[PDB]
Amino acid sequence: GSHSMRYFHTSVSRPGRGEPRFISVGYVDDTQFVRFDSDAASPRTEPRAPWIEQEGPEYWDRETQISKTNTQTYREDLRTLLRYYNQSEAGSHTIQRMSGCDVGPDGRLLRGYNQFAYDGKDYIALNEDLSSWTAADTAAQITQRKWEAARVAEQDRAYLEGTCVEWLRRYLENGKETLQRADPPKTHVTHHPISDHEATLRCWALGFYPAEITLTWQRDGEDQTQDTELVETRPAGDRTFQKWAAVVVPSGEEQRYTCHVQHEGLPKPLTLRWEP
Amino acid sequence: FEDLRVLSF
Amino acid sequence: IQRTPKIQVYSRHPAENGKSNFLNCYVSGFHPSDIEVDLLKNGERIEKVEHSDLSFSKDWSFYLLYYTEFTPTEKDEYACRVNHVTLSQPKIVKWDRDM
């Protein structure tokens, strides 16, 4: 189906504890494939998936230099935002960036991204047109004016339409065994009495890839969104993901509840019930 | 593949 | 403005007594990124626990997976202990095979 590539940058200041650390991680869909950490004893862009290991020395050397230079740019940006927000040099602050591209089944560009946050709040984002910016506040409007004057969006657009989509297509081919394989969820329902009056029904999904899934409970065919406890989808550590959804049911009414599972790996959505 | 940041804030 | 971590403690595979597995503690939804996570066996810290590389979600909140190889038994108690600037005291979440 459709696929994504994303790079996640985090830079965090630590006044009195040296210079801000910079981390860059890269993903294709829900698979991490590269990392760089400026706090490592010998910072280097390193492989994190088997299918990227085949890239030659020039790939590793070029990406390492890019991340070493980006480390410095983010340190400059942290100093800049202390000025733009009238903040002291005493506190710790964070800049984040997410950038990348989505492609369809034919490998054509669906959309690009280049967006930033300061202290966990939106700062500036490239709009979907890849030609204009959304600034969150008057500080980000200063960056917007600077970036409009320098025609930054044109340069970001060229990377997102060219390099990003070309390398994502290459990675998808090189990693086709895993990146292009959906693992459906293994599902079951558990039952636990809470008291003489109620019991919990928990619908499990395990071992699935990619992470996107829909897990819902119905009571007499009606969605129980407000009454369902739904945990965040979580990594198992073997590439796959897990999720559960639970409902508290009146004793003796268990068969009125059905669990519904939708996932890319399933040709047809599943319906499950507690099977005593 | 990721490129250099285009420009500082 | 800060965001407190959500914490889930669980195993990689369904737990079977005497079968090697992985104990996971997944912390997510937090901001800022500095966080302290320990995995505990009968209240004591497990040494050399590994963790994933720092990343974040669409809402900018961070997530990390801490994990260690373990062989569960009927008597051994496992937990995850988390500290973050948003918490007055460490938060302990016990491992429950059914969660």
Numbering used by the authors:
A (entry chain A): 1 to 276
B (entry chain B): 1 to 9
C (entry chain C): 1 to 99
Give the article text:
Our previous work identified NP338 as an immunodominant CD8+ T cell epitope in individuals expressing HLA-B3739. Our conservation analysis of the NP338 viral peptides across vaccine and circulating IAV strains, including pH1N1, H5N1, and H7N9, found 16 natural variants of NP338 peptide, with the most common mutations occurring at position (P) 5, 6, and 7 of the peptide. To understand the molecular basis of cross-reactive TCRαβ recognition, we solved the structure of NP338 and its variants bound to the HLA-B37 molecule, as well as the structure of a cross-reactive TCR in complex with HLA-B37-NP338. Thus our data demonstrate that CD8+ T cell cross-reactivity in the context of NP338 peptide and its variants is favored by similar conformations adopted by the epitopes.
We then solved the binary structures of the NP338 peptide presented by HLA-B37, HLA-B18, and HLA-B44. The NP338 peptide adopted an extended conformation in the cleft of HLA-B37, with the P2-Glu and P9-Phe acting as anchor residues in the B- and F-pocket of HLA-B37, respectively. In addition to the primary anchor residues, the P5-Arg acted as a secondary anchor residue, fully buried into the F-pocket, and formed a salt bridge with Asp77 from the α1-helix in the HLA-B37 molecule. The remaining six residues were all solvent exposed and represented potential contacts for the TCR. The NP338 peptide could bind each of the three HLA molecules (HLA-B37, -B18, and -B*44:05); however, the stability of HLA-B37-NP338 was superior by 6 °C to HLA-B18-NP338 and by 14 °C to HLA-B*44:05-NP338. The additional anchor residue observed in the B37-NP338 complex could explain the higher stability of this pHLA complex. The hydrophobic P6-Val residue sits near the α2-helix and interacts with Val152, Gln155, and Asp156 of the HLA. The P7-Leu residue sits above Trp147, with its side chain interacting with Ala150, Val152, and Lys146. Interestingly, the comparison of HLA-B37-NP338 in its free and liganded state with the EM2 TCR revealed that the peptide (r.m.s.d. of 0.2 Å) and HLA-B37 (r.m.s.d. of 0.3 Å) did not change conformation upon TCR binding. The structures also demonstrated that only HLA-B37, and not HLA-B18 nor HLA-B44, binds the NP338 with a secondary anchor residue (P5-Arg), revealing the hydrophobic surface of the NP338 peptide, which might help cross-reactivity.
